[PDB]
Amino acid sequence: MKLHELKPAEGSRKERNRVGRGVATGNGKTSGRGHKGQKARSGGGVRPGFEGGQLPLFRRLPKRGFTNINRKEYAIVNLDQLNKFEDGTEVTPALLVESGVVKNEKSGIKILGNGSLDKKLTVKAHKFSASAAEAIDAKGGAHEVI
């Protein structure tokens, strides 16, 4: 469009609300803060989660668990995610990274089963679920744990 007649997209822009400018705006004197107390003061208000001296929720409740410094968490691929290849293709972690079905291998590729194959192909990933292995084999085509 022209540089003297340009228009933003309808509903994309909105004028911001300026506070404390006259009483016809509705936010004039007290500026939307009510009258007194902390909430009216500049920098007032209270720390989030504070409950006025009542024992806060996250100290009523107990801690639980620990973090394992070495979790082997895997990038997962489901069965219906493999129908985007052809029949007889040999699919490997590098190939499915290339095809973009896996954006990063986190600690390996685990094949799981949600859809179905409807195809015949061999797979070679780091881990398999029982259902995934059986469904790979049902149509013919092997699964190598690497």
Binding site: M1, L3, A9
Partner: protein, 206 residues
Amino acid sequence: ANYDVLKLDGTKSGSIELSDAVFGIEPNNSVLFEAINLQRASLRQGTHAVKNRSAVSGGGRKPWKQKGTGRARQGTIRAPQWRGGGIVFGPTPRSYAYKMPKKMRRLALRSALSFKAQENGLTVVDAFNFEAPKTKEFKNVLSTLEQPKKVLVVTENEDVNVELSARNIPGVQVTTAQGLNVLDITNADSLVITEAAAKKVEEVLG
């Protein structure tokens, strides 16, 4: 999709096939607006500042005691209500430039070029072959091509002679195929592009 190629005298030499994927799309005015706005906010070097009550010289002692004088309590001579000191919320140095996704940038370029191609504001020439910088000759070239006052000339690469030949004509700006930008295209009323530049733009812009 077919644009007749003209020589600098204005006569038809040949024709070129320019794609509808770069020069025949329906312009996206929302993306085009966002691109122009980003482009024009990118040129701001906001170097504005004021002095708040800390940056203003002096004013570190309490001007008078808190009670007993009959005067309003004050704490510094440079408080914002005082004359001569303390700006509360003034301009600060900052940048005004933001980013748009890459596909949106190329869609904005394509929409600008398509808008300039549907208004019959795209003229393709074969070459320029200016062997010396001469403004008068470029002015005659533009007049023979019947171009509006505002025109953007696009070369395949940096043609030094054409650049120099068109610096001093007011309302004519020179650019390369890679140097194309939405603000410059939308400013110009007409585009005069070399065939090689047209093909390069078609390659780059999808």
